[PDB]
C-alpha cells in the first residue's frame, strides 16, 4: 500500500506478498471472530481504495458477505453523494475535486486520482470513510453470522464456569447493544443461567459482586 | 520488478522467488476461481513484458489453459500489429522503435529492450496492456473451469440458502454479464430459485427488499 | 509503532505483520503463563496507545480474562482521574492537556494527539503508563490462570529432585506474594519438602549455602 | 549475481542463500520435470558463471543426469573453442580477451575475472553462453526422463477428454522435435488418438479448428 | 538494537521476533549443550542490556538454571561494585560514572542511560561485561549438566569406538578446565579405557600417530 | 560478514541469523555428502575468520569431525609457520604484519585485527585461506563415512539399473583420487558389475560408450 517515506511525502507502494497471504490466511483460518475486526484495521493503514477493492475481490468464498457489503458500499456512497454538495466548474489544476460515489469505491477511479486525493491540501481521506464503510457491513456481517443469541446461553451441569463465561461474553461482543444494555445483560444474565450451586452462591456474595470473586467462589 | 525506490526514481529489479512460489503454489492448491485474477494482478504491477511472460511460463500442470492463452496472446498480438501501422523513422538515442505483436508478449524482447522501453519518453507501458490481454484470457478461462450453468441453479427441498446463495454468487463471479445484466439477474433468479416456502415468504415481503431481509424472512 | 528515523525528525509508523502475526500465534498456542509477561514487553516497547489496545483485541478466546483486564483498566484511569490535578480552565495554544482517563486506553483519543504527548515539551510517557497497567493486569490473568497455590508442592520419593526445584521456582514465578516473603520462603520451603536423606543432608550442610551447594549436595 | 547500483556504478552483490535453498529443495521434492527449465533462467539472472556452477554443485540425488550435462558441457566448450581459436597479442589495458572453453565454463576462472569481462565494452556473455549451455543439458535430460513417445498416446474409453489433452499437451511440450512439425501434428493426433464421441464431434466440425472449439465441442 | 545503516551512523532498533523466537526454540528443543554458548554471542552482537535480559527471560521451564545465573550476576555485580572504585559525588555535566551493579543487569536503569553510556566518550562496553557473566553462567550450567565425568568412560565389548570417541570429545567439550588438560587427556585416555583390541592395535602403532590414523588402523 | 558498501568502503557485518540456521539445520537434517561441500563455500562467500569458526561450532553431534579439522587446521598453522617465516622489525603506521599460524584461526587475533587485515593495502585475503584449509579438511571428512570401496558395487538381479548406476556416481564423486583413474573407472567398472543380459549388450555396443546410451540400452 501507501508507505512512508523518509523525511518525504506518503508514496504508493506495491502489495507486500506477505501481508496479502496473511489476509488469505486470517480469512481462511476462522473468518467469523469479531478478533478479525481489528485484523483490518492492522493492515488497512493508508491504503488505497484500490488496495480495498482487490482485498475484497481476493477473499474466496462466502460471496453472500461480498454482495452484502456492496449493496451497504451503493447505499452509502448513494446517501454520501446526496448530503455532500455537488462540485463542477473548472477543477484547480493539481489537484481533484472531492471524489463521488464510483470514484470512492474505485470503480471509474485510477491509482493517480486517489494518490493526489491522499496528498490533497486539505487532504481528503476517501479511503478512511471507505474502509469505515467496509468495517459497518464487517458489524452486520458478523451479527448475521452469529449462530446464537444472548439470553439462550445456558450453563451445563457439568460444563465450567470458565468456557460458560467466556461464551457469554464472546455473545456479548458478538451483540452491537448500547453500553448501558451490556452492563445490564453481563449484571444479570451471567447469574441467570449459571449452575444451581455456585449461583446461589454468588446470590450469597451479594451485589455488585466482582467476577474475581464470583470465580473463585465457583470452584468446586 | 520495477519497483518504486523510496526517496528515489523507480528502478528495475529482479523477481523475487517468494511471489512466484506464493504464485505457483496458489495456482496448485486452488482452482481457476474469479478470485484468483486481482491476485494475479496483486503481483504483476510494475513488472516488464519479460517478468509476465516468466511469470506466466512458471505454470505447474494445466498446459490446455496455457495453449488457450497463448493463441489469445497471439490474436490480439495479430491485432495489435494490425490497428498500429509500422512506425517508421530515425532510430536514436532517447527514442526506441515501437514494439511488435511479438514484442509486446516478451517473446523475442529481451529483458533490457522493455526496461529501455520503460524508460522512453513517453512511457510506453505496453507491457501493462499485455497483462491485460491475460486478463482477458483469464476471464474466459474460468467459464472453461466452471462449466455449470447458472439458468439450472436451483434450490433444493433440503439445500439451505446460505449455500445456494453462495454458489449463484460463485457462478456470478464466473458468468461474463454487465453490472446490470448482473443486478437484474439476480434480482430475479434469486426469488425465482428458491424453496417454495420462501418464494411464498418473501413474496409476501414484496420486491424491494435488500438480501438481508431474503436471508432474513425464510431461516429454516 | 514509535520509531526514530536516521539523520531526522521523529515519525511515528504502523505495526508491522510479523510482531501481530507472531503475537497472536504465541498466545494462541501458548497458555497464560508467566513466561508470557515478559514476551509482551519484548514486542511492545515504545508503541502508541492505540496500538496497543489493537493488539490487545487481536486475540482470540478467554474473554473472561480481557473482561477483568477492561474492568481493571477502567478502575485504574478513574483512580488516576481522581488522583492527579485534572488542569481546568483555558489551555495556551501550542500545549496538550493532560491524558484523560479514556485517552490513555485510547478508545478517544487520536493518534495525533498521541504523537502529540510522544513529542511534547516534556513529553508525556502515558504510553509507559498504558503498558503498565497491561503489566499488572497480565499479573492478575496469570494469578487467575495458575493451577495449583505455592505451599502444596511436595517432592516424589523416587522422583528426582531437579524437576521438583524446577516446577518450584516455576510456581514461584507465578506467584503473587511480594519480594521479602518469597526471599524467606525460597531458603526454607524446598529443604523442608524434600526426601528426608537429603533434607538432612542440606541441614548438615548449613544455612546461607546457595542452590548450587544444595543441589550437589543432594546428588545420588 | 551482478546487481546495478543506486544512481550509480556496477557492483557485484552477494548470492542471496534463501533462492538456492528454495531452488534444490523443489528439485529434489517435486519432480525432474521440464517446468524447471524456464523458473532456472528466473533464478539466474545476471549471475556469473561461478554462481551457475555452484547452482549446479549444490543438487542432491540423481548425479547420472549431472555427469550427462557435464559432458555436454565438456564436448560444447570443445567445439567453441575449435570454432572459434584461442586469441593471442599482448591484453590492453582496459579490455580483455574472451574467456577459453575452460573460462566460459566457470571452473578455472575467479569472480574478478567474470567482473573484468563484464566491465569490459563489448561485454562478453560468457555467463549467458553457459546459461543455454546448461539449458540445452537439462533439455537433453527431459528427453531422456520422457517414459512414452508422443505417437503412442491412446484416450481410454472411460476417461474424460481434459486429462487426455492435459497428457498430449504436457508431453508435446517434453518433446524436443522441431517446432514445425509439433504445431502441425498438434492439431491431428490429438483427435486420431481420441475417444469416439470426440471423433464423431470433430469430424461432424469438419478439418481446421481452433482447440478451445474442439475441447467445447467434446464437451458433454 | 545496536545495528549499523548503510553508510550512516548506528540508530537504535528492536530485536525482530523471528530471532527471539528461534533462540527459545532451540533452547528448548536442542539441549543445554556447550555448542550454545556460541550460538548466544551469534544472537547478541550489538545488543543493549535490556534486549540481553529481555532474551534471558523469554525462556520457558529451567527455572533453577535462572536463579542460578541470576544468582552468579548478583554476585559477580557485588564484585565489580567492590573492585571497581565507588565514585562519591556528581560529575561534569555531559558525562555520567560508571553504571553501578544492578545497572548492568538493567533491573534499575532504564534504557536511556544505557544509550548514553554506549553514545559517551570513552564507550562503556557494559554490554560486554553482562554477556560475559552469561557466557560463565552457561559454562558452569553446562557443567553442572554434565551427567558423567570424563575419567570414567568406558568403551563397550561390541560398541565400534566412533562413538566411544564422540562421546569422550562431547563430555570433554562439556569439561570447564585449561586446554593443555584437554590435550593431556585426548593423548591419554582415549586408549586407556578402550577394547582390547584396538587397545593392542593403538599400542603396536605407536603414541606418535595423530587420531586418524589410530582410528584407521582398529576398524571393526 | 563480508559485504560490499552501495559505491563506498568496505565495512564489516555481522552473521545473519537466517544463514547459520540454514547452515545448522542442513548440517544437522542432511547427512555428510559432497553436495554440502559447495552450499558451505555459498554460505561462506567473504567472512572473517571468527565467523568461519563461529559457524563451525554451531554444529552439535559428531564432535570427532570437529576434531579431525581442528587437528588438521594446526598442522596447516605449522606448515604456515614454517614455510613463511616470522617477520620483526618496524610496522608501518595504518597497516598490520601478516597473520600467523594462530591468527588465521582467529584464536588470538580479535575482530580489529580482522577488519584491519579486511582492509589493509594490498588486501590480506587470510580468511580465504583459511576457508581453504577446511576444504582439505572435509575432504579427509567425505573418506570418513563411506560405507564401501568404488569396486565392490554389483547390480541386483532385481534391482534396476538405474539404481546402481546412480550408486556409482554417488561412490565415485564421494571418492577423492586423480581424474586419470576416474576416467579409466568409468568404462570399465559399470559395464563389468552390471546385469548380464544389458551387459552383454553393452559389450557388442562396444568402445565409446556414453551413459546415456548405456542406460537406455539397458532398460527391459
Ligand atoms: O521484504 P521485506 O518485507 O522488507 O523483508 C526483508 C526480506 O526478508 P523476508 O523476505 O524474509 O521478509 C529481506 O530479504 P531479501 O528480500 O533481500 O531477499 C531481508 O534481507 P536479508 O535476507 O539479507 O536478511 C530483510 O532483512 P534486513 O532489513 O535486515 O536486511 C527483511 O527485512 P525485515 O527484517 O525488516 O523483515
Ligand atoms: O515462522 P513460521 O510461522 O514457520 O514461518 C516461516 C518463516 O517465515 P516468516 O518470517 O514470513 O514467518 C521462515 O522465515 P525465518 O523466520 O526462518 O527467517 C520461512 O523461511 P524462509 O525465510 O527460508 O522462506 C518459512 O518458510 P519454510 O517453512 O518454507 O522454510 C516460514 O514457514 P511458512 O512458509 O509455513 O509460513
Given at each position: 500500500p501507501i508507505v512512508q517515506n523518509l523525511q518525504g511525502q506518503m508514496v504508493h507502494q506495491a502489495i507486500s506478498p506477505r501481508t496479502l497471504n496473511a489476509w488469505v490466511k486470517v480469512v481462511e483460518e476462522k473468518?467469523?471472530?469479531?478478533e478479525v475486526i481489528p485484523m483490518f484495521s492492522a493492515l488497512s493503514e493508508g491504503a488505497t481504495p484500490q488496495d480495498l477493492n482487490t482485498m475484497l475481490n481476493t477473499?474466496?468464498?462466502?460471496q453472500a458477505a461480498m454482495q452484502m457489503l456492496k449493496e451497504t458500499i451503493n447505499e452509502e456512497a448513494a446517501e454520501w453523494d446526496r448530503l455532500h454538495p455537488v462540485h463542477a466548474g473548472p477543477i484547480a489544476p493539481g489537484q481533484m475535486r472531492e471524489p463521488r460515489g464510483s470514484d470512492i469505491a474505485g470503480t471509474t477511479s485510477t491509482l493517480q486520482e486517489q494518490i493526489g486525493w491522499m496528498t490533497?491540501?486539505?487532504?481528503?481521506?476517501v479511503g478512511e470513510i471507505y474502509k469505515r464503510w467496509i468495517i459497518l457491513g464487517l458489524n452486520k456481517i458478523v451479527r448475521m453470522y452469529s449462530?446464537?443469541?444472548?439470553?439462550?446461553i445456558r450453563q451445563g451441569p457439568?460444563?465450567?464456569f470458565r468456557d460458560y463465561v467466556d461464551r457469554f461474553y464472546k455473545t456479548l461482543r458478538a451483540e452491537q447493544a448500547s453500553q448501558e444494555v451490556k452492563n445490564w445483560m453481563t449484571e444479570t444474565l451471567l447469574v441467570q443461567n449459571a449452575n444451581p450451586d455456585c449461583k446461589t452462591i454468588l446470590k450469597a456474595l451479594?451485589?455488585?459482586?466482582?467476577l474475581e470473586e464470583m470465580m473463585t467462589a465457583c470452584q468446586g
Open positions: 473468518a467469523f471472530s469479531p477473499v474466496g468464498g462466502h490533497h491540501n486539505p487532504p481528503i481521506p449462530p446464537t443469541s444472548i439470553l439462550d457439568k460444563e465450567p451479594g451485589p455488585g459482586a466482582t
